[PDB]
Paper text:
Pro225 and Pro296 reside in loops α3-β2 and α6-β5, respectively, flanking the edges of the active site – Pro296 near the adenine moiety and Pro225 on the 5′-side of the ligand, next to Pro226. The kcat values of P225G and P296G are slightly higher compared to the wild type enzyme, most likely due to conformational flexibility offered by the glycine residues. P225G is the only mutant with an increased specificity constant (kcat/KM). We attempted to co-crystallize P225G in the presence of ligands. However, the reasonably low resolution (2.70 Å) crystal structure, which we obtained from crystals grown in the presence of reduced nicotinamide adenine dinucleotide 2′,3′-cyclic phosphate (2′,3′-cNADP+), contains only poorly defined ligand density in the active site.
Residue numbers in the entry: 162 to 205, 213 to 293, 299 to 378
The structure:
């Protein structure tokens, strides 16, 4: 049997990946300047977040669908054998970014998947949240933080937002509204969604 990739996911083009990478850099630089962030620094001299989130990927940003660990992961073989997965393999997709976010552990961009893009999303064996809510693009990680965290951090954020714990926006950036969720969490609800071009394929390390 042919073993699977490390993980499936949409991989952004050079232009898209550069666009979002700079968009995230500006966000972290602006958030680090904002007065509302400095007050709640103890909950989280100046702390520049670009350094703080030092761990970032090889350089091509991606939105992971299914982590297969070459087949070691559960539901890996089940996932890859799907027709939509093999049909969509190598095909280009347009992902939408609704927001950027930051926690003490991770920083990333929230992806909003279209229904067709939802057919490529796994549903293996996160309560009351529509599938695909986890969809994200990691922008950086803290030193002792695993890659897996970034997805979990987004879910936990959206768990609060549906409750209305974000409340008032503590600031207004030129590209969106800024939100304090406490416990070091920060969300930038983008005014206009960022669209990016990405190819759905498998990554083998
Ligand atoms: N249980 C898991 N263990 C390790 N990596 C996982 C994982 N689930 C998803 N991943 C992804 O494995 C890759 C390792 O770089 C990451 O992209 C991570 O997605 P993420 O970066 O979007 O959070
Ligand atoms: Cl995932
Ligand atoms: Cl999910």
């Amino acid at each position: 049997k042919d073993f699977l990739p490390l993980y499936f996911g949409w991989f952004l083009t050079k232009k898209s990946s550069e666009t979002l990478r700079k968009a995230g850099q500006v966000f972290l630089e602006e958030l680090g300047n904002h007065k509302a962030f400095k007050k709640e620094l103890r909950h989280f001299e100046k702390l520049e977040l670009v350094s703080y989130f030092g761990k970032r990927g090889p350089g091509v940003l991606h939105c992971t669908t299914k982590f297969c660990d070459y087949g070691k992961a559960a539901g890996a073989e089940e996932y890859a054998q799907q027709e939509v997965v093999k049909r969509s393999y190598g095909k280009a997709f347009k992902l939408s970014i609704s927001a950027l976010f930051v926690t003490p552990k991770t920083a990333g961009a929230q992806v909003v998947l279209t229904d067709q893009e939802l057919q490529l999303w796994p549903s293996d064996l996160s309560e009351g949240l529509p599938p695909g809510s986890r969809a994200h693009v990691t922008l950086g990680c803290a030193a002792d933080v695993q890659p897996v965290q970034t997805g979990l951090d987004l879910l936990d954020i959206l768990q609060q937002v549906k409750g209305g714990s974000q409340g008032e926006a503590v600031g207004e950036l030129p590209r969106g509204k800024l939100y304090s969720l406490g416990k070091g969490r920060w969300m930038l609800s983008l005014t206009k969604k960022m669209e990016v071009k990405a190819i759905f394929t498998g990554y083998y390390g």
